[PDB]
UniProtKB/TrEMBL annotation, chain A:
<comment type="function">
    <text>Inner capsid protein that self-assembles to form an icosahedral capsid with a T=2 symmetry, which consists of 120 copies of VP2, with channels at each of its five-fold vertices. This capsid constitutes the innermost concentric layer of the viral mature particle. It encapsidates the polymerase VP1, the capping enzyme VP3 and the genomic dsRNA, thereby defining the core.</text>
</comment>
<feature type="region of interest" description="Hydrophobic">
    <location>
        <begin position="6"/>
        <end position="26"/>
    </location>
</feature>
<comment type="subunit">
    <text>Homodecamer; each decamer is made up of two conformers of VP2, called VP2A and VP2B. Interacts with a VP1-VP3 complex. Interacts with the intermediate capsid protein VP6. Interacts with NSP5. Interacts (via N-terminus) with NSP2.</text>
</comment>
<feature type="region of interest" description="Hydrophobic">
    <location>
        <begin position="34"/>
        <end position="54"/>
    </location>
</feature>
<comment type="similarity">
    <text>Belongs to the rotavirus VP2 family.</text>
</comment>
<protein>
    <recommendedName>
        <fullName>Inner capsid protein VP2</fullName>
    </recommendedName>
</protein>
Length: 98, 50
């Protein structure tokens, strides 16, 4: 239960696509909030929102809503708004075993 | 016969910094709503060192 910190460059369009697999498997409670957000916003402003032609989001520093939790409401597709619902609600399930 | 400026009783027995603790502990739970996140946890942990 360390908290990982993502390290990347914005100008690599493949490292941001491979980050889409990372946030959808590892729950976002582990990635640190100052660096989960800067990766979760970089997928929005580069890959998701130019694909639909929408305006790239003004995401101010320190908004309480992470930019996948604010882009499942602003997007109007159904299949990329079903993956953005899983990433927004991917959590560990604290059960006691043995 | 000597006037001397004396403190009150709640500082002389130290009981007031218990009230500062509860003022400072709830200051470290409140989400700083527009503050950047790496400046929020550096100012909440800096409170918990006191």
């Amino acid at each position: 239960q360390r908290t990982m910190s993502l390290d990347f460059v914005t100008t690599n369009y493949m490292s941001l696509i491979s980050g889409m697999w990372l946030l959808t498997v590892v729950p976002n409670d582990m990635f640190i909030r100052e660096s989960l957000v800067a990766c979760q916003l970089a997928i929005i402003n580069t890959i998701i929102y130019p694909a639909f032609g929408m305006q790239r989001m003004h995401y101010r520093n320190g908004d309480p809503q992470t930019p996948f939790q604010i882009a499942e409401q602003q997007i109007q597709n159904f299949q990329v708004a079903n993956w953005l619902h899983f990433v927004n609600n991917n959590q560990f399930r604290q059960v006691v075993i043995d | 016969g000597v006037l001397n400026q004396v403190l009150n009783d709640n500082i002389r027995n130290g009981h007031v910094v218990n009230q500062l603790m509860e003022a400072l502990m709830q200051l470290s739970r409140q989400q700083f709503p527009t503050m950047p996140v790496d400046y929020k946890r550096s100012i909440q942990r800096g409170i918990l060192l006191l």
